[PDB]
Amino acid sequence: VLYVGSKTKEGVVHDVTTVAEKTKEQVTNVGGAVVTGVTAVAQKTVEGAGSIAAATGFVKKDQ
Amino acid sequence: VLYVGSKTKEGVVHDVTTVAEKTKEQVTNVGGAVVTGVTAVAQKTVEGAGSIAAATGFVKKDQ
Amino acid sequence: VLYVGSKTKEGVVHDVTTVAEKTKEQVTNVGGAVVTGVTAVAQKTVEGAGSIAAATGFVKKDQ
Amino acid sequence: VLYVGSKTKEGVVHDVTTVAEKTKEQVTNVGGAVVTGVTAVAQKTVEGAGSIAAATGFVKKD
Amino acid sequence: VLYVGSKTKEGVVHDVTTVAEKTKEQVTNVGGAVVTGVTAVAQKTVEGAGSIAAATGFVKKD
Amino acid sequence: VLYVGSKTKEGVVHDVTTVAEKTKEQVTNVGGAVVTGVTAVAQKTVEGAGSIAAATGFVKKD
């Protein structure tokens, strides 16, 4: 498993450019999840049973 | 498994450019999930049974 | 497992450029999660059963 | 050259507001200008000799 | 050259506001200018000889 | 050259506000200028000889 001469880019994120202006906002939450904003999750590997990788706004009520 | 001379791009994200202006917003949540915003998930691998990779707004009520 | 001459970029994040202006905001939370802001999670590996890697706004009520 | 998501305003006028409640006015005039109200001039390019551009309440005589 | 998300304003005028409550005014004039109100001039380029650009309440005589 | 997220304002005028409550005014004039109100001039480039640019309440005679 070898790279001799290259440019290897795995699991990256860039130039994520967000601009806002005069943005008014109201939020109300009771018990749940609310995700309002820039998020960058860059991974290369997640191993394992029953896993959760890179969740976002994840309401997990179980019984 | 080898790259000799190349440009390898796997699982990437770029130039994600979001612009907003004069955006007014109201949200109300009770127990669930609400996802209002830029999200970039870049992975190369997720291994494993019963997994969840890169969820978003994921209400998981189980019994 | 060897790189001879290269440029290896795994699990990175850059140039995440967020601009805001005149942004007014109100939030109210009771018990849940609320994520309103720039987030960069860059990993290369997460190993293990029943894991959670790189959660965000993750309400986990269990029984 | 390439503009991604950009905004390019060369000689514009915007987001002007004039609120007025319970305003009382009176005017009298004799042979001259009076400008009581909103004006919004946006010119990109003007040329000439002895030009007059974007005048308001102008009085010329000889 | 490349503009990503940029904003480029060359000769603009914006976000002007004039609030007025219970305003009383009177005016009298004789052969001259009076400018009582809002003006918003935005010029990018003006040329000439002996030019007059963006005048307000101007009186010229000879 | 590349502008990422930048803002470039060359000759602009913005975020001006004039609030007025219960204002009383009177004016009298004879053959001259009076400028009682808001003015917002934004010029990027002016040229000429003997030019006059962005005048307000100007009186010229001979």
Swiss-Prot record, chains D, E, F:
**What does the record say mutating Y3F does?**
No effect on osmotic stress-induced phosphorylation
Where do the sequence repeats start and stop? 6-20, 21-31
Localization recorded for this chain is: Cytoplasm; Membrane; Nucleus; Synapse
Q: Please tell me in which tissues this protein is expressed.
A: Highly expressed in presynaptic terminals in the central nervous system. Expressed principally in brain.
Which residues of this UniProt protein bind Cu cation?
H14
The protein's role, per its UniProt record: Neuronal protein that plays several roles in synaptic activity such as regulation of synaptic vesicle trafficking and subsequent neurotransmitter release. Participates as a monomer in synaptic vesicle exocytosis by enhancing vesicle priming, fusion and dilation of exocytotic fusion pores. Mechanistically, acts by increasing local Ca(2+) release from microdomains which is essential for the enhancement of ATP-induced exocytosis.
The disease tied to this protein in UniProt is:
Genetic alterations of SNCA resulting in aberrant polymerization into fibrils, are associated with several neurodegenerative diseases (synucleinopathies). SNCA fibrillar aggregates represent the major non A-beta component of Alzheimer disease amyloid plaque, and a major component of Lewy body inclusions. They are also found within Lewy body (LB)-like intraneuronal inclusions, glial inclusions and axonal spheroids in neurodegeneration with brain iron accumulation type 1. Parkinson disease 1, autosomal dominant: A complex neurodegenerative disorder characterized by bradykinesia, resting tremor, muscular rigidity and postural instability. Additional features are characteristic postural abnormalities, dysautonomia, dystonic cramps, and dementia. The pathology of Parkinson disease involves the loss of dopaminergic neurons in the substantia nigra and the presence of Lewy bodies (intraneuronal accumulations of aggregated proteins), in surviving neurons in various areas of the brain.
Q: Please give the family membership noted in the entry.
A: Belongs to the synuclein family.
The record comments on the domains as follows: The 'non A-beta component of Alzheimer disease amyloid plaque' domain (NAC domain) is involved in fibrils formation. The middle hydrophobic region forms the core of the filaments. The C-terminus may regulate aggregation and determine the diameter of the filaments.
Q: Which residues carry this modification: Phosphoserine?
A: S51
State what protein this is by name.
Alpha-synuclein
Quaternary organization: Soluble monomer. Homotetramer. A dynamic intracellular population of tetramers and monomers coexists normally and the tetramer plays an essential role in maintaining homeostasis. Interacts with UCHL1. Interacts with phospholipase D and histones. Interacts (via N-terminus) with synphilin-1/SNCAIP; this interaction promotes formation of SNCA inclusions in the cytoplasm. Interacts with CALM1. Interacts with STXBP1; this interaction controls SNCA self-replicating aggregation. Interacts with SNARE components VAMP2 and SNAP25; these interactions allows SNARE complex assembly and integrity.
Its PTM note reads: Phosphorylated, predominantly on serine residues. Phosphorylation by CK1 appears to occur on residues distinct from the residue phosphorylated by other kinases.
Give each disulfide bond as a residue pair: none
Q: Where is this region: 4 X 11 AA tandem repeats of [EGS]-K-T-K-[EQ]-[GQ]-V-X(4)?
A: 1-31
Q: Which residues of the full protein are shown?
A: 37 to 98 of 140
